[PDB]
Amino acid sequence: TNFTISVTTEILPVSMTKTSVDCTMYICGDSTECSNLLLQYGSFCTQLK
Amino acid sequence: TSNFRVQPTESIVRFPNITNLCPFDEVFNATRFASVYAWNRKRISNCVAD
Known part of the structure; x- marks a missing residue:
């Protein structure tokens, strides 16, 4: 015979922070020889990027 | 494309001011x-x- 209007809150995530990871700087910075060996290791950096 | 960096100009050495020589004569020419x-x-x- 009656009613009760109630308001409910729903929280849904949409996105997050877009993080870009540098290849040479995170692994070994200010190192030319380490970058040379790294490139030899393969092409993982292009796939990760 | 890639990542840019700033190359260093020169190198600086900051070793402590030590002038006396080590007594290697009493350990190698004993x-x-x-x-x-x-x-x-x-x-x-x-x-x-040295």
Whole structure:
């Protein structure tokens, strides 16, 4: 015979922070020889990027 | 494409001001040496090894 209007809150995530990871700087910075060996290791950096 | 960086210009050495020479003559040009069961121990500190 009656009613009760109630308001409910729903929280849904949409996105997050877009993080870009540098290849040479995170692994070994200010190192030319380490970058040379790294490139030899393969092409993982292009796939990760 | 890639990542850019700033190359260094020169190098700076900041070793402490030590002028006395290490006494390597008494450990390498000694008259006699000890045995393996009674080996000596010489502490070398606060000098410059050329």
